Scaffold this active site. Structure first.
Site, PDB file in Angstrom:
ATOM      1  N   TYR A  28      43.644  -6.194  16.483  1.00 18.28           N
ATOM      2  CA  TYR A  28      43.042  -5.145  17.307  1.00 18.28           C
ATOM      3  C   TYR A  28      43.430  -5.138  18.777  1.00 18.28           C
ATOM      4  O   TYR A  28      43.274  -4.107  19.423  1.00 18.28           O
ATOM      5  CB  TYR A  28      41.478  -5.161  17.217  1.00 18.28           C
ATOM      6  CG  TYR A  28      40.990  -4.569  15.913  1.00 18.28           C
ATOM      7  CD1 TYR A  28      40.823  -5.374  14.787  1.00 18.28           C
ATOM      8  CD2 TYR A  28      40.715  -3.206  15.806  1.00 18.28           C
ATOM      9  CE1 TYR A  28      40.402  -4.814  13.561  1.00 18.28           C
ATOM     10  CE2 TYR A  28      40.288  -2.638  14.585  1.00 18.28           C
ATOM     11  CZ  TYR A  28      40.146  -3.453  13.482  1.00 18.28           C
ATOM     12  OH  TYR A  28      39.736  -2.909  12.274  1.00 18.28           O
ATOM     13  N   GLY A  30      45.566  -4.601  21.565  1.00 22.16           N
ATOM     14  CA  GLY A  30      46.801  -3.839  21.728  1.00 22.16           C
ATOM     15  C   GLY A  30      46.670  -2.455  21.135  1.00 22.16           C
ATOM     16  O   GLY A  30      45.599  -2.041  20.647  1.00 22.16           O
ATOM     17  N   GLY A  32      46.314   0.641  18.963  1.00 22.08           N
ATOM     18  CA  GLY A  32      45.797   0.733  17.608  1.00 22.08           C
ATOM     19  C   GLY A  32      44.977  -0.473  17.161  1.00 22.08           C
ATOM     20  O   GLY A  32      44.519  -1.301  17.963  1.00 22.08           O
ATOM     21  N   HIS A  48      35.890  -2.793  21.670  1.00 18.14           N
ATOM     22  CA  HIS A  48      36.472  -1.997  22.746  1.00 18.14           C
ATOM     23  C   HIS A  48      37.198  -0.754  22.227  1.00 18.14           C
ATOM     24  O   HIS A  48      37.065   0.329  22.803  1.00 18.14           O
ATOM     25  CB  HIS A  48      37.412  -2.910  23.557  1.00 18.14           C
ATOM     26  CG  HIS A  48      37.988  -2.271  24.779  1.00 18.14           C
ATOM     27  ND1 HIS A  48      39.311  -1.879  24.853  1.00 18.14           N
ATOM     28  CD2 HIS A  48      37.427  -1.947  25.969  1.00 18.14           C
ATOM     29  CE1 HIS A  48      39.546  -1.367  26.049  1.00 18.14           C
ATOM     30  NE2 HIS A  48      38.420  -1.394  26.747  1.00 18.14           N
ATOM     31  N   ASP A  49      37.979  -0.902  21.153  1.00 23.60           N
ATOM     32  CA  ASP A  49      38.629   0.233  20.515  1.00 23.60           C
ATOM     33  C   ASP A  49      37.607   1.273  20.080  1.00 23.60           C
ATOM     34  O   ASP A  49      37.819   2.463  20.270  1.00 23.60           O
ATOM     35  CB  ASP A  49      39.384  -0.201  19.258  1.00 23.60           C
ATOM     36  CG  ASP A  49      40.705  -0.919  19.533  1.00 23.60           C
ATOM     37  OD1 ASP A  49      41.094  -1.211  20.701  1.00 23.60           O
ATOM     38  OD2 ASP A  49      41.435  -1.240  18.562  1.00 23.60           O
ATOM     39  N   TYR A  52      36.310   3.168  23.110  1.00 22.17           N
ATOM     40  CA  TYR A  52      37.237   4.213  23.548  1.00 22.17           C
ATOM     41  C   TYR A  52      37.186   5.403  22.599  1.00 22.17           C
ATOM     42  O   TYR A  52      37.237   6.536  23.038  1.00 22.17           O
ATOM     43  CB  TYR A  52      38.659   3.688  23.596  1.00 22.17           C
ATOM     44  CG  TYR A  52      39.050   2.987  24.890  1.00 22.17           C
ATOM     45  CD1 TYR A  52      40.390   2.736  25.176  1.00 22.17           C
ATOM     46  CD2 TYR A  52      38.093   2.573  25.820  1.00 22.17           C
ATOM     47  CE1 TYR A  52      40.774   2.098  26.357  1.00 22.17           C
ATOM     48  CE2 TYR A  52      38.461   1.940  26.999  1.00 22.17           C
ATOM     49  CZ  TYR A  52      39.802   1.707  27.277  1.00 22.17           C
ATOM     50  OH  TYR A  52      40.187   1.064  28.447  1.00 22.17           O
ATOM     51  N   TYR A  73      38.918   5.069  37.228  1.00 20.61           N
ATOM     52  CA  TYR A  73      37.506   4.988  37.608  1.00 20.61           C
ATOM     53  C   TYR A  73      37.399   3.973  38.733  1.00 20.61           C
ATOM     54  O   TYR A  73      38.391   3.299  39.060  1.00 20.61           O
ATOM     55  CB  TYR A  73      36.623   4.601  36.408  1.00 20.61           C
ATOM     56  CG  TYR A  73      37.015   3.294  35.750  1.00 20.61           C
ATOM     57  CD1 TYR A  73      36.772   2.067  36.386  1.00 20.61           C
ATOM     58  CD2 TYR A  73      37.614   3.281  34.495  1.00 20.61           C
ATOM     59  CE1 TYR A  73      37.125   0.849  35.766  1.00 20.61           C
ATOM     60  CE2 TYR A  73      37.977   2.091  33.880  1.00 20.61           C
ATOM     61  CZ  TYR A  73      37.745   0.892  34.524  1.00 20.61           C
ATOM     62  OH  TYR A  73      38.088  -0.296  33.938  1.00 20.61           O
ATOM     63  N   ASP A  99      35.189  -1.109  29.376  1.00 22.29           N
ATOM     64  CA  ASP A  99      36.095  -2.138  29.934  1.00 22.29           C
ATOM     65  C   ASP A  99      35.378  -3.376  30.431  1.00 22.29           C
ATOM     66  O   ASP A  99      35.831  -4.491  30.175  1.00 22.29           O
ATOM     67  CB  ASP A  99      36.919  -1.534  31.080  1.00 22.29           C
ATOM     68  CG  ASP A  99      38.014  -0.595  30.588  1.00 22.29           C
ATOM     69  OD1 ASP A  99      38.753  -0.041  31.444  1.00 22.29           O
ATOM     70  OD2 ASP A  99      38.226  -0.337  29.383  1.00 22.29           O
TER      71      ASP A  99
END
Ligand SMILES: [Ca+2]
Ligand SMILES: [Cl-]
Length: 123
Positions: A28, A30, A32, A48-49, A52, A73, A99
């Site tokens: 995970y 990186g 994709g 985190h993916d 997003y 941001y 993040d």
């Protein structure tokens, strides 16, 4: 944006170059990600993916021309603590939170070198 996420991870892990250390790790960390996370660090990247992915669903993010990797941001690092800013608008604030949570997550889990540059057959 990636520039900010890099600085956040350095905020929590001052010895790291995060775009090297935490890119191409597990299934995970990186671009994709698929399959079962290989360890807790890889699970931080899965979360985190997902964060997003949820950001892209928000009405406020659909109004900008730039994605979570390029959407700037505001935040601060101070005394190795991350603070997202009230001056961020809704999309920016959401990404800042994704993040921050991941940078903290990465700092609290083992790093397993055997999972760096993992064969995609594993995912
Ligand atoms: Ca990923
Ligand atoms: Cl923090």
């Amino acid at each position: 944006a990636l520039w900010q996420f890099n600085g956040m991870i350095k905020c929590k892990i001052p010895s790291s170059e995060p775009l090297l250390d935490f890119n191409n790790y597990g299934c995970y960390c990186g671009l994709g990600g698929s399959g079962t996370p290989v360890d807790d660090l890889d699970r931080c990247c899965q979360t985190h993916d997902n964060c997003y992915m949820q950001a892209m669903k928000l009405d406020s993010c659909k109004v900008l021309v730039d994605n979570p990797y390029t959407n700037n941001y505001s935040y601060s690092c101070s005394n190795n603590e991350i603070t997202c800013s009230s001056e961020n608008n809704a999309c920016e604030a959401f990404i800042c939170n994704c993040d921050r949570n991941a940078a903290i997550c990465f700092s609290k889990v083992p790093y397993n070198k055997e999972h760096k540059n993992l064969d995609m057959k594993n995912c």
